[PDB]
Design a protein around this ligand. Structure first.
Ligand SMILES: CCCCCCCCCCCCCCCCCC(=O)OC[C@H](COP(=O)(O)OCCN)OC(=O)CCCCCCCCCCCCCCCCC
Ligand SMILES: CCCCCCCCCCCCCCCCCC(=O)OC[C@H](COP(=O)(O)OCCN)OC(=O)CCCCCCCCCCCCCCCCC
Ligand SMILES: CC(C)CCC[C@@H](C)[C@H]1CC[C@H]2[C@@H]3CC=C4C[C@@H](OC(=O)CCC(=O)O)CC[C@]4(C)[C@H]3CC[C@]12C
Ligand SMILES: CC(C)CCC[C@@H](C)[C@H]1CC[C@H]2[C@@H]3CC=C4C[C@@H](OC(=O)CCC(=O)O)CC[C@]4(C)[C@H]3CC[C@]12C
Ligand SMILES: CC(C)CCC[C@@H](C)[C@H]1CC[C@H]2[C@@H]3CC=C4C[C@@H](OC(=O)CCC(=O)O)CC[C@]4(C)[C@H]3CC[C@]12C
Ligand SMILES: CC(C)CCC[C@@H](C)[C@H]1CC[C@H]2[C@@H]3CC=C4C[C@@H](OC(=O)CCC(=O)O)CC[C@]4(C)[C@H]3CC[C@]12C
Ligand SMILES: CC(C)CCC[C@@H](C)[C@H]1CC[C@H]2[C@@H]3CC=C4C[C@@H](OC(=O)CCC(=O)O)CC[C@]4(C)[C@H]3CC[C@]12C
Ligand SMILES: CC(C)CCC[C@@H](C)[C@H]1CC[C@H]2[C@@H]3CC=C4C[C@@H](OC(=O)CCC(=O)O)CC[C@]4(C)[C@H]3CC[C@]12C
Ligand SMILES: CC(C)CCC[C@@H](C)[C@H]1CC[C@H]2[C@@H]3CC=C4C[C@@H](OC(=O)CCC(=O)O)CC[C@]4(C)[C@H]3CC[C@]12C
Ligand SMILES: CC(C)CCC[C@@H](C)[C@H]1CC[C@H]2[C@@H]3CC=C4C[C@@H](OC(=O)CCC(=O)O)CC[C@]4(C)[C@H]3CC[C@]12C
Ligand SMILES: CC(C)CCC[C@@H](C)[C@H]1CC[C@H]2[C@@H]3CC=C4C[C@@H](OC(=O)CCC(=O)O)CC[C@]4(C)[C@H]3CC[C@]12C
Ligand SMILES: CC1(C)O[C@@H]2[C@@H](CO[C@@]3(COS(N)(=O)=O)OC(C)(C)O[C@@H]23)O1
Ligand SMILES: CCCCCCCCCCCCCCCC
Ligand SMILES: CCCCCCCCCCCCCCCC
Ligand SMILES: CCCCCCCCCCCCCCCC
Ligand SMILES: CCCCCCCCCCCCCCCC
Ligand SMILES: CCCCCCCCCCCCCCCC
Ligand SMILES: CCCCCCCCCCCCCCCC
Ligand SMILES: [Ca+2]
Length: 1319
C-alpha cells in the first residue's frame, strides 16, 4: 500500500484545484438557498436541492480518494491526515458518505446529528486557498496571549457564581400575581416577592424563574450562565431589579456593580492591554519590519518622484486652447471653485426631510440635474481638456469619475423606478477631505490612507474570514434552530429559518447586543429550562469568540495601519526637516514609540490673601457645597431640607463672592467658570428675593439658573494641580483624535444623508395593524392581542427613532453606534414599504445591507481607529527629570531593584530539635502541601454542589463536608504557626488571608448552630462570604494570573486622579439629572420606573451607570423628554393640573453627551493604565525585565545560601551553567562562549575570594543588557564612573556603603573573580 507510480500526484495541479474551488462555492450557495420549515415540512425548492447532495458527496470523496492515493494516510509522515486541514476535510466527506447511508437503513439509527457536519463545508474554502490560511493563522496567533484573560475571566465568573449560589439560590420563585382566582394576572415585567411582599391587592404565588425559568441562580450551571450574561452587560439590570424585588434593594448593588466593573470593564482593560502588547511585539518581527521598509522605500520613491514631476514646466486647436485648459483647470482658484460648489451640493442634499415644502422638492429636483451636469462639465474639462490617457492617475480623480457615473446611474434608475432613491451623490462630500491639504495634518492622514491602501489584500482577506465564520455559524444555527422558532406568540424577527435571517441574527449575537433574548428563544425552542438548555452553548461560544475575535481583528487592522502611518510620517520630518535642511546648507516620542524602538534595537491688603489656609480652606467649601448639592430633594420643593440647603446656598455664594472679589482685586481684568457660577447665584438670589411674580413663568427661571450650581465641583479642577494635569491629559488626547473625529463626522453625515434618502417618511405605523395609511388610521378598534380584547383608539404614529431629517438620522445612527436597540431599528427598517404607508413584516429585507456596512465602518473600524490613536500617541505623564533619565530608561531603570531583594527565606527552624524539624518539616517537602491543595480542590467543589430543593441527606452531606474541610483548614492554620512562629506566620499576606477565612468559616459553623440566640437586630448571612472566599486559594497556584492582577492593580494605584475625573463626571451628571428630571412622575410602562429614576442621588447614579454600561439608555432618554407627568410634590397648592410639563427636551443633549463623555473618559482611564504597564505587556524572553530577574534569588537561595559572600567562584558556574539564558550561559553553553561572557564581567573580591549578592546581580544585569561595560582596563572603570554618576542621578537615597556595593569599583590592580579562570 506504498505502491509508487502514483500518476495521481500530477493530477493535484493547476486546473483540478480550481474546479474543487468551484464545487465548494456551488455547495455553499446550495446551503444558502435552503429554508427550514417547522415540523418535517419542506419547501418545493428544498426538495429540489436535496437531490444534489450526492453530486457534492461524490466529488468530495473523489478528492479524498485522489489525495489519499497520491499521498499516504497516517503512517507515511507527509501523509494525508498529517496535514491539519485534511483531517477536517476527511471528517466532512466521511459524514457526507455516512449521512447519505440512511435510506438503506431507513435511518433507523435516528441520527438527527450527522448532516450538521455539512455546515463545516464553507471552511473548505480556507483549506483550498492558502492565501487565507496564512491570514487565519496570523489572527489565531494574536489570540494566544488571551488564553490567560480567559482563565482570569472564567475564574471571576466562577467566583461570582459561587456567591450567587449562596445568596439567590432559591429566592426568585415567588411572584406577585393578581388575586383574580382562576385567571392569575401578574405584571408584564413580572414582580417577584420576598419578605418584600406584594404591593396593593396582589398575592404572592408560585412562579417559574424570570425568563421562563432561565435567569436564576439555582444550580452552579444556572449561576455561571446568569453571571456570564451580566458580564456581557446584556440585561444585567433586569437581574439586578429582580433580586432587588425578591430580597430588598439594600445589598444587591454590591454584587452587580463589582460584577460589571471587575468582570466587564477591568477585563476589557486587560484584553486591550494584552493585545496592544502583542501588537507592539509583533510589528517588530523581521518578516514585518521587512514588509514595512518595503512600504517606506516606495513612499520615498513617490515623494521624490512627484517633486521631479514638478520639473515638467514646459511653456489648429490641438495646442491653441488645450494649453489654457490645463492651465486654468489646475489653478488654485479652480480647486476652490469646485470645493466651494461641492459644499453647496452637500448642503442641498442635506435639507431634504419628510414633508418638505412643495417648492423645495422642485427646486432640489432641478438642483440634482444642475450640479450633476456641472460636474460632468468640470470632469470632461479634465478629460477632453487634459487627456483621457493620463486622467486616472489621481486617486480622487478616479473617485470623482466613479461618483459621476454613479449619479448618472441614480438619475436613470430613479426615472425607471420611482421610489427607492438611495442617492449616491452625497459621496462628493468626501472631496471635502481634500481641504486638509491646506493644513499641517495632511501627512498624518495621507499616510494613513497609503498604509490602508497598501494593506488591502490582507484586510479584504480578513473580512472574508470573518464572513466565512459568520456563514458557518449561520448554517449551524439553521441546523439547530431552523424552523423551531414558530412559537404560539409568533415567530420572532431574530429567526434562523432562512439564510438572510440567520446571517442577521448571528450578526446580533456577534455585536452582542440582545444576544440575551435570542438565547432565550433558542432555549425554549429545544425544550425549555429542561432538556433544552444544552443550546445555551451556541450563544456563549459566539458571544465570546466574537466579541473578542472581532476586537482582535479590527484592532490589529487599526493599530497596524496606524503605527505604520505614524512611522511613515516620522520619516518625513526626519528627512525634509533634518536631511535637506542640513545638507542644503526622543523629542516628544510617545510611550508606544519609545517601546517599539527599544524592541527594534533589541490691592496692598488683599495680596495677603495667601495664608496657607486660603487656597486650601476654599477647597473644603467647594467640597461641602458639592456634597450639599447631592442632598437636595428634587421633588419636595419646599420641604425642610431644601430650606436648610437654601440657607447653605446663601453661605456658599457668600464665600465664593468674598473670594472672587479679592482675587479680581489682585489680578485685574478657568476663572470664567468661577465668574459664571457666582453671577448666576447672585442673579437667581436677587430676582427670587425681589418679586418672584409679575414676570412670565419665571419660577423656571430660578429653577434653571440654579442648575449653574452644579458647576461648583468643577472649580476643584484648577485648584488641585494634579487633577488639572489629568484634565489636561484628557484634553490633549481629544486634540490628538480630532483630525479623525472630523473624518468620522463626515462619514457619519454621509450615512445619515443616505439613510434619510432611504427611510424618509417610511417609519410610520398605525396602532391598528390592519390599517396602513393616515386616512384609514382613524376611529376605534378592538385590541385582541393584549389577550384582554379591549377597545383602543387608532393613532397614526412614528417609531421613536426614525430617519426623516438629517438630525434624526444622525441621532438614530448614533444610537446604532453605541449598540443599544439597533435590532429594533433594523426590524423597523426591513419592515418598510413606502412614504406615508405602514409597515409590512420582513418586506425589503435588503435594507439590512445598510446596517452591516454601517457596522463594519463605524462601530468596528473607526472606534478601533480611535482606540489605536489614543494608544499609539500616549505621552508619559510626568517626564521632566533631565530628559527622562537620559541613559537609564524603563527596562534599564526599573530593573535596578537591586536596591531591594537582598533578603532570603530566614524561615528554617535552625534548631534541629523535635517539632522544629518535625512540623516545620512535615509542612515543607510536599506530602502535606499536596494533600492540602487536594482539600482546596475539593472544597471548591462542595461550594459548587449547592442547589435548590435538594433531597435532604445531600443537604446534610454538604454541611458535614464543610465541617471536615474547615477542620482541615484550621489544622493548616495551627500547624504552621507552631511550625513557622507567630510573628513569621502573619507576614506572608496569604497566611493572614487563610486565617481570616478559617476564622470566618469557624464562626459561621458556630453561629448557624445553637447556644446563641439569633436576635438583637443583626444578620448572619454575610459570613457565607468567608466560606466562598476559599476558592481564592486556587488563585495562589497561579503566578500568571497573579502577575497580571498585581501588575494591572498597581497601575490603578498610580492613577488616583484619572478615576476621580470619572467620579466627577458621574457626580456632575447625577446632579444635573436630579435637578432636571427629578420630578418626572414614575410610570411602570415607561423607563422611569421605581427602579430607574432620577428621584435621588443614588437612584440617578444607578441610572447613569446603567446607561454607561449601555443598557437601554435610548429609552431612558426618550422617557425623560418633555411633556411628561409630574410628581404631586405634596408641598404646594398650585400647579396641580398645570406643570404637566415635567420632562425636558434637553434629554437628547443630556444622554448623547454623557454617552460620549463616559465612553471617552473611560478610554483614557484604559489607556492610562495600559501604557503604565507597557513594559510588562511587551515583555519578551530575549529582552530582560525583572520577570527573569527574580529567578536569581531562587537559584541563589537554593544553590548557595551565601548571605553576602560564601560563593568564592564555584557558585558562579554552579549558577549560570544551568538556568535559562536571558541571564547568560545556560545549560547548553558551558564552553569558551561562557568564557568570553565571563571575561566581560569583572568585579572585586572578598574574604574567601567571595563576592556580594547585588554586585553579582548588576554583573548579570549589565552583561546581559549591556549597561555601560567596556572590554577591560581603566576604560571599564571610567565607564563605571559614568554609571555611578547615572545611579546617583536617578537615586540619591543610596548610601555610599550600598552605592559602593552597586558600583563595586574593580580597579585594575585588584584582581577579580572574573580574571581567575580566564588567565
Ligand atoms: C468585591 C465582591 C463583593 C461581593 C459581595 C456580595 C454580597 C451579596 C449580598 C446580596 C444580599 C442582598 C440582600 O439584600 O439580601 C438580604 C438578605 C436577607 O436574608 P435572606 O435572603 O432571607 O437569607 C437569610 C439566610 N440566613 O441578607 C443578606 O443576604 C445580607 C448579605 C450582606 C452582605 C454584606 C456584604 C458586605 C461587603 C462584602 C465585601 C466582600
Ligand atoms: C466543566 C464545567 C461544566 C460541567 C457540566 C456538567 C454537566 C452535568 C450534567 C448533569 C445532569 C443532571 C440532570 O439530569 O439534571 C436534570 C435537571 C432538570 O432540571 P429541571 O427540573 O427541568 O429545571 C431545574 C431548574 N433549576 O437539569 C438541570 O438542572 C439543568 C441542566 C442544565 C443547567 C444549565 C446549563 C446552561 C449552560 C452552562 C454552560 C457552562
Ligand atoms: C452644511 C451642511 C453640511 C449642513 C447644513 C445644515 C442642515 C442640513 C440642517 C440644519 C438644521 C436642519 C433642519 C432643522 C429642522 C427642520 C424642521 C423639520 O421639518 C419640519 O418642521 C416638518 C414639517 C415641514 O416641513 O414644515 C425637519 C427638517 C428641518 C428643516 C431640518 C433640515 C436639515 C437642516 C436644515
Ligand atoms: C457625608 C458628609 C459627612 C460629607 C461632608 C459634608 C457635610 C460636612 C455636610 C455639608 C452639608 C450638610 C447637610 C446640610 C443639611 C442637612 C439637613 C439636615 O436636616 C434634615 O435633613 C433632617 C431631617 C430629619 O429630621 O429626618 C440633615 C443633615 C443635612 C442633610 C446635612 C448633612 C451633612 C452635610 C452634607
Ligand atoms: C462613505 C463611505 C463609507 C463609503 C461607503 C458607503 C456606501 C458605499 C454604502 C453606505 C450604505 C450602503 C447602501 C445601504 C443600503 C442599500 C440598499 C440596498 O437596496 C437598494 O436600495 C436596492 C434595491 C431596492 O431597494 O430597490 C442596495 C445596497 C445599498 C444601496 C447600500 C450600498 C452601499 C452603501 C451605499
Ligand atoms: C477535582 C477537580 C476536577 C475539581 C476542581 C479543581 C481543579 C481545577 C483542580 C484539579 C487538579 C488541580 C491542579 C493539580 C496540580 C497543579 C499543578 C500546579 O500548577 C502550577 O502552576 C504549579 C507551579 C508552576 O509550575 O508554576 C499547581 C496548580 C495545579 C494546576 C492544580 C490546580 C487545580 C486543579 C486543576
Ligand atoms: C468540573 C466538574 C467537577 C464540574 C462540577 C460538577 C458538580 C460540582 C456540578 C456540575 C453539574 C451539577 C448538577 C447539574 C444539575 C443538577 C440537577 C438538579 O437537581 C434536580 O433535579 C433539581 C430539581 C428542582 O430544582 O426542582 C440540581 C442539582 C444537580 C445535580 C447539579 C449539582 C451540582 C453539579 C453536579
Ligand atoms: C469529596 C467531595 C468533594 C464530594 C463527594 C461527593 C460524593 C462522594 C457524595 C457526597 C454527598 C453524596 C450525596 C448525598 C445524598 C444524596 C441523596 C440521595 O437521595 C436520597 O433521597 C437518599 C435516599 C436514601 O439513601 O435513603 C441520592 C444520593 C445523593 C445525591 C449522594 C450522591 C453522592 C454524593 C454527592
Ligand atoms: C471546576 C472547573 C469547572 C473550574 C475550576 C476553577 C478554575 C477556573 C481554576 C481552578 C484551578 C485554576 C488553575 C490552577 C493553576 C494554573 C496554572 C497556572 O499556569 C501558569 O502560571 C504557568 C506556569 C508558570 O509560568 O509559572 C495558571 C493557570 C491555571 C491553569 C489556573 C487557572 C484557573 C483554574 C483552572
Ligand atoms: C477575584 C480576583 C480579581 C481578586 C484576587 C485578589 C488579587 C487582586 C490579589 C490578592 C492578593 C494578591 C497577591 C498578594 C501578594 C503577592 C506577592 C507579590 O509578589 C511580587 O511582588 C512578585 C514576586 C517576587 O518578586 O517575589 C505580588 C503578587 C502577589 C501574588 C499578589 C497578586 C495579586 C493578588 C492575588
Ligand atoms: C473604574 C472605577 C473604579 C472609577 C470610579 C467609580 C465610577 C465608575 C462610578 C460610576 C458608577 C458609580 C456607581 C453607580 C451606582 C452605584 C449604586 C449606588 O446605590 C446606592 O447607593 C443604593 C442602592 C441603589 O442603587 O438603589 C451607590 C453608588 C454606586 C455603587 C456608584 C459608585 C461609583 C461608581 C462605580
Ligand atoms: C500584529 C498585527 C498588528 O496584526 C497582524 C499582524 C500582521 O499584520 C496584519 C495586520 O492586519 S493588516 N491587513 O492591516 O496588515 O495583517 C495580518 C496579515 C492580517 O495580520 C495582521 O500585525
Ligand atoms: C497544521 C496547521 C493547521 C492547524 C490545524 C487545523 C486548524 C483548522 C481546522 C479547525 C478549524 C475549526 C473547526 C471548528 C469549528 C469552527
Ligand atoms: C477559556 C475560557 C474562556 C471563558 C469561558 C467562560 C464561559 C462561561 C459560561
Ligand atoms: C490620498 C488620500 C488623502 C485622504 C485624506 C483624508 C483621509 C482620512 C482618513 C480616511 C479613512 C478611510 C476609512 C474608511 C472606512 C473603512
Ligand atoms: C430635536 C431633534 C433631535 C436633536 C438631537 C440632538 C443631538 C443630535 C446629534 C447626535 C450626535 C451626532 C453625532
Ligand atoms: C455580510 C453580507 C450579507 C448580509 C446578509 C443580509 C442581507 C441579505 C440581502 C438579500 C436579502 C434577500 C431576501 C430574500 C427573502 C428572504
Ligand atoms: C442528584 C444530585 C447529584 C449530585 C452529583 C454530584 C457529582 C459530583 C462529582 C465530583
Ligand atoms: Ca444592551
Amino acid at each position: 500500500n506504498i505502491v509508487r507510480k502514483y500518476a495521481k500526484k500530477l493530477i493535484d495541479w493547476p486546473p483540478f484545484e480550481y474546479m474543487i474551488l468551484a464545487t465548494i462555492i456551488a455547495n455553499c450557495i446550495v446551503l444558502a438557498l435552503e429554508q427550514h420549515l417547522p415540523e418535517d415540512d419542506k419547501t418545493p425548492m428544498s426538495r429540489r436541492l436535496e437531490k444534489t447532495e450526492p453530486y457534492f458527496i461524490g466529488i468530495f470523496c473523489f478528492e479524498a480518494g485522489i489525495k489519499i492515493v497520491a499521498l499516504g494516510f497516517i503512517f507515511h509522515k507527509g501523509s494525508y491526515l498529517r496535514n491539519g486541514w485534511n483531517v477536517m476535510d476527511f471528517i466532512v466527506v466521511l459524514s457526507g458518505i455516512l449521512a447519505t447511508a440512511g435510506t438503506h437503513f431507513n435511518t433507523h439509527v435516528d441520527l438527527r446529528t450527522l448532516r450538521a457536519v455539512r455546515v463545516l463545508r464553507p471552511l473548505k474554502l480556507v483549506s483550498g486557498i492558502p492565501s487565507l490560511q496564512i491570514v487565519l493563522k496570523s489572527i489565531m496567533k494574536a489570540m494566544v496571549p488571551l488564553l490567560q484573560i480567559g482563565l482570569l475571566l472564567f475564574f471571576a465568573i466562577l467566583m461570582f457564581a459561587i456567591i450567587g449560589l449562596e445568596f439567590y439560590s432559591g429566592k426568585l420563585h415567588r411572584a406577585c400575581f393578581m388575586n383574580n382566582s382562576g385567571i392569575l394576572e401578574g405584571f408584564d415585567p413580572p414582580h417577584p416577592c420576598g419578605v418584600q411582599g406584594c404591593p396593593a391587592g396582589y398575592e404572592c404565588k408560585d412562579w417559574i424563574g424570570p425568563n421562563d425559568g432561565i435567569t436564576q441562580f439555582d444550580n452552579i450551571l444556572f449561576a455561571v450562565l446568569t453571571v456570564f450574561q451580566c458580564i456581557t452587560m446584556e440585561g444585567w439590570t433586569t437581574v439586578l431589579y429582580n433580586t432587588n424585588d425578591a430580597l430588598g434593594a439594600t445589598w444587591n448593588w454590591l454584587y452587580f456593580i463589582p460584577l460589571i466593573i471587575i468582570g466587564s470593564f477591568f477585563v476589557l482593560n486587560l484584553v486591550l492591554g494584552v493585545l496592544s502588547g502583542e501588537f507592539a511585539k509583533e510589528r517588530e518581527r523581521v518578516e514585518n519590519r521587512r514588509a514595512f521598509m518595503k512600504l517606506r522605500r516606495q513612499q520615498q520613491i513617490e515623494r521624490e518622484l512627484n517633486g521631479y514631476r514638478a520639473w515638467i514646466d514646459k511653456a489648429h486647436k490641438e495646442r491653441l486652447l488645450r494649453i489654457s485648459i490645463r492651465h486654468m483647470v489646475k489653478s488654485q482658484v479652480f480647486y476652490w471653485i469646485v470645493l466651494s460648489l461641492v459644499a453647496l451640493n452637500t448642503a442641498c442634499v442635506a435639507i431634504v426631510h419628510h414633508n418638505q415644502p412643495q417648492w423645495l422638492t422642485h427646486l432640489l429636483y432641478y438642483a440634482e440635474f444642475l450640479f450633476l451636469g456641472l460636474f460632468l462639465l468640470e470632469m470632461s474639462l479634465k478629460m477632453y481638456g487634459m487627456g483621457p490617457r493620463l486622467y486616472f492617475h489621481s486617486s480622487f480623480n478616479c473617485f470623482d469619475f466613479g461618483v459621476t457615473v454613479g449619479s448618472i446611474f441614480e438619475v436613470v434608475w430613479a426615472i425607471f423606478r420611482p421610489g427607492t432613491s438611495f442617492g449616491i451623490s452625497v459621496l462628493r462630500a468626501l472631496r471635502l477631505l481634500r481641504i486638509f491639504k491646506i493644513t499641517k495634518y495632511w501627512a498624518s492622514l495621507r499616510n494613513l490612507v497609503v498604509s490602508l491602501m497598501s494593506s488591502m489584500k490582507s484586510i479584504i482577506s480578513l473580512l472574508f474570514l470573518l464572513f466565512l465564520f459568520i456563514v458557518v455559524f449561520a448554517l449551524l444555527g439553521m441546523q439547530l434552530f431552523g424552523g423551531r422558532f414558530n412559537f404560539n406568540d409568533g415567530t420572532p424577527s431574530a429567526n434562523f429559518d432562512t439564510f438572510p435571517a440567520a446571517i442577521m441574527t448571528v450578526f446580533q449575537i456577534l455585536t452582542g447586543e440582545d444576544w440575551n433574548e435570542v438565547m432565550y428563544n433558542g432555549i425554549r425552542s429545544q425544550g425549555g429550562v429542561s432538556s433544552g438548555m444544552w443550546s445555551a452553548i451556541y450563544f456563549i461560544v459566539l458571544t465570546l469568540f466574537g466579541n473578542y475575535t472581532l476586537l482582535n481583528v479590527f484592532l490589529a487592522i487599526a493599530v497596524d495601519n496606524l503605527a505604520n502611518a505614524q512611522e511613515l510620517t516620522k520619516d518625513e520630518q526626519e528627512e525634509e526637516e533634518a536631511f535637506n535642511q542640513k545638507h542644503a546648507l526622543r523629542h516628544h516620542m510617545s510611550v508606544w514609540e519609545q517601546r517599539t524602538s527599544q524592541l527594534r534595537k533589541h490691592r496692598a491688603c488683599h495680596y495677603i490673601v495667601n495664608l496657607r489656609y486660603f487656597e486650601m480652606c476654599i477647597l473644603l467649601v467647594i467640597a461641602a457645597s458639592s456634597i450639599a448639592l447631592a442632598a437636595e430633594d428634587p421633588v419636595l420643593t419646599n420641604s425642610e431640607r431644601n430650606k436648610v440647603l437654601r440657607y447653605f446656598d446663601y453661605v456658599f455664594t457668600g464665600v465664593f463672592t468674598f473670594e472672587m472679589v479679592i482675587k479680581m482685586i489682585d489680578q485685574g481684568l478657568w476663572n470664567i467658570l468661577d465668574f459664571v457660577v457666582v453671577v448666576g447665584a447672585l442673579v437667581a438670589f436677587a430676582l427670587a428675593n425681589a418679586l418672584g411674580t409679575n414676570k412670565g413663568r419665571d419660577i423656571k427661571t430660578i429653577k434653571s439658573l440654579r442648575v449653574l450650581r452644579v458647576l461648583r465641583p468643577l472649580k476643584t479642577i484648577k485648584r488641585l494641580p494634579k487633577l488639572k494635569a489629568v484634565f489636561d491629559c484628557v484634553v490633549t488626547s481629544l486634540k490628538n483624535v480630532f483630525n479623525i473625529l472630523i473624518v468620522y463626522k463626515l462619514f457619519m453625515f454621509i450615512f445619515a444623508v443616505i439613510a434619510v434618502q432611504l427611510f424618509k417618511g417610511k417609519f410610520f405605523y398605525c396602532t391598528d395593524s390592519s390599517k396602513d395609511t393616515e386616512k384609514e388610521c382613524i376611529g376605534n378598534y378592538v385590541d385582541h392581542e393584549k389577550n384582554k380584547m379591549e377597545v383602543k383608539g387608532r393613532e397614526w404614529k412614528r417609531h421613536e427613532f426614525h430617519y426623516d431629517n438629517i438630525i434624526w438620522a444622525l441621532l438614530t445612527l448614533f444610537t446604532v453606534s453605541t449598540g443599544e436597540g439597533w435590532p429594533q431599528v433594523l426590524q423597523h427598517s426591513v419592515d418598510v414599504t413606502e412614504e406615508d404607508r405602514g409597515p409590512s413584516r420582513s418586506n425589503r429585507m435588503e435594507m439590512s445591507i445598510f446596517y452591516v456596512v454601517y457596522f463594519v465602518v463605524f462601530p468596528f473600524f473607526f472606534v478601533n481607529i480611535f482606540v489605536a490613536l489614543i494608544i499609539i500617541t500616549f505621552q508619559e505623564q510626568g517626564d521632566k527629570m533631565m530628559e527622562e533619565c537620559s541613559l537609564e530608561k524603563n527596562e534599564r531603570a526599573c530593573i535596578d531593584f537591586a536596591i531591594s531583594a537582598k533578603p532570603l527565606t530566614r524561615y528554617m527552624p535552625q534548631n534541629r530539635h523535635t517539632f522544629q524539624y518535625r512540623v516545620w518539616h512535615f509542612v515543607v517537602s510536599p506530602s502535606f502541601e499536596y494533600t492540602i491543595m487536594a482539600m482546596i480542590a475539593l472544597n471548591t467543589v462542595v461550594l459548587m454542589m449547592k442547589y435548590y430543593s435538594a433531597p435532604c441527606t445531600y443537604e446534610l452531606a454538604l454541611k458535614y463536608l464543610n465541617i471536615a474541610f474547615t477542620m482541615v483548614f484550621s489544622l493548616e492554620c495551627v500547624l504552621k504557626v507552631i511550625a513557622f512562629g507567630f510573628l513569621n506566620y502573619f507576614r506572608d499576606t496569604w497566611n493572614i488571608f487563610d486565617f481570616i477565612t478559617v476564622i470566618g468559616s469557624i464562626t459561621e459553623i458556630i453561629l448557624t448552630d445553637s447556644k446563641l440566640v439569633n436576635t438583637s437586630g443583626f444578620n448572619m448571612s454575610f459570613l457565607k462570604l468567608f466560606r466562598a472566599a476559599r476558592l481564592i486559594k486556587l488563585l495562589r497556584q497561579g503566578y500568571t494570573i497573579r502577575i497580571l492582577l498585581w501588575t494591572f492593580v498597581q497601575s490603578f494605584k498610580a492613577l488616583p486622579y484619572v478615576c476621580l475625573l470619572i467620579a466627577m463626571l458621574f457626580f456632575i451628571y447625577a446632579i444635573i439629572g436630579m435637578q432636571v428630571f427629578g420630578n418626572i412622575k414614575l410610570d411602570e410602562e415607561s423607563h422611569i420606573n421605581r427602579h430607574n429614576n432620577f428621584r435621588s442621588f443614588f437612584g440617578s447614579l444607578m441610572l447613569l451607570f446603567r446607561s454607561a454600561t449601555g443598557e437601554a439608555w435610548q429609552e431612558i432618554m426618550l422617557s425623560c423628554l418633555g411633556e411628561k407627568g409630574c410628581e404631586p410634590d405634596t408641598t404646594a397648592p398650585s400647579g396641580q393640573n398645570e406643570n404637566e410639563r415635567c420632562g425636558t427636551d434637553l434629554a437628547y443633549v443630556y444622554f448623547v453627551s454623557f454617552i460620549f463623555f463616559c465612553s471617552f473618559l473611560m478610554l483614557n482611564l484604559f489607556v492610562a493604565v495600559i501604557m503604565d504597564n507597557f513594559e510588562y505587556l511587551t515583555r519578551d524572553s530575549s529582552i530582560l525585565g525583572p520577570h527573569h530577574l527574580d529567578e536569581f534569588v531562587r537559584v541563589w537561595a537554593e544553590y548557595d545560601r551565601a548571605a553576602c559572600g560564601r560563593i568564592h567562584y564555584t557558585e558562579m558556574y554552579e549558577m549560570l551553567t544551568l538556568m535559562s539564558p536571558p541571564l547568560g550561559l545556560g545549560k547548553r553553553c558551558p564552553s569558551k562562549v561562557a568564557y568570553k561572557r565571563l571575561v566581560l564581567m569583572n568585579m572585586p573580591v572578598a574574604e574567601d575570594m567571595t563576592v556580594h549578592f547585588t554586585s553579582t546581580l548588576m554583573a548579570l544585569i549589565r552583561t546581559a543588557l549591556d549597561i555601560k561595560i567596556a572590554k577591560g582596563g581603566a576604560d571599564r572603570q571610567q565607564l563605571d564612573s559614568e554609571l555611578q554618576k547615572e545611579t546617583l542621578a536617578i537615586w540619591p537615597h543610596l548610601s555610599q556603603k550600598m552605592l559602593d556595593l552597586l558600583v563595586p569599583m574593580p580597579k585594575a590592580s585588584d584582581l577579580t573573580v572574573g580574571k581567575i579562570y580566564a588567565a
